[PDB]
Amino acid sequence: AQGVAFPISRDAFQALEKLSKKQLNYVQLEIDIKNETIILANTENTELRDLPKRIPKDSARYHFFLYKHSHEGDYLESVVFIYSMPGYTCSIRERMLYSSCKSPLLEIVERQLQMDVIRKIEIDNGDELTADFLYDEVHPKQ
Incomplete structure (x- = not known):
């Protein structure tokens, strides 16, 4: 293997x-x-208006959504990877287990499930998860 994974x-x-x-x-x-x-x-049922209430504020966790957008005259919909951690109160052994699985857990979608991914979005609190932020994350100034 190229490095540590789970x-x-x-x-x-x-x-x-x-x-x-x-x-x-x-x-x-x-x-x-x-x-x-x-x-x-x-x-349980969630939309991008109710997603901020699923995200925690005292621990790291992992989440997935299906975002919907349009470009070049067509409309499109696919999977988003979302991550949360506080840093200020999570355990040292918790946060570094999340970050160490972040690479292989994406290959299990992209190569084992053979499924495309819109973006690999990351937040502090989940309050930032909104249709405006999900657009700006997927269509940056790059």
Whole structure:
């Protein structure tokens, strides 16, 4: 292997596999330090107006959405990877397990599920998750 990495758990993958066909659009995950792996946390209904309330404020967590946009005269819709952590109150062993799985957990979407991804968005608090921010993250000045 090129570096340190960890697998996904069954329940987390059992939701990401359905998100790869627009079936859910609202998957919620967390790490399991007991096994150093990403596990499922929720799959209750959420939209980009209710997403800020799913995001925590005292721990790191992982989240996925399906964002909708338009360019060059056509309309398009696909998966977004979203991450949250506070830094000010999460445990040292928590935050560095999240960041260490961030690369292989994206290859499990892009290469094991063979599914495209809109963006790899990151927030401090989730209050910033809005249709204006999701546009500005996907259409930067680059």
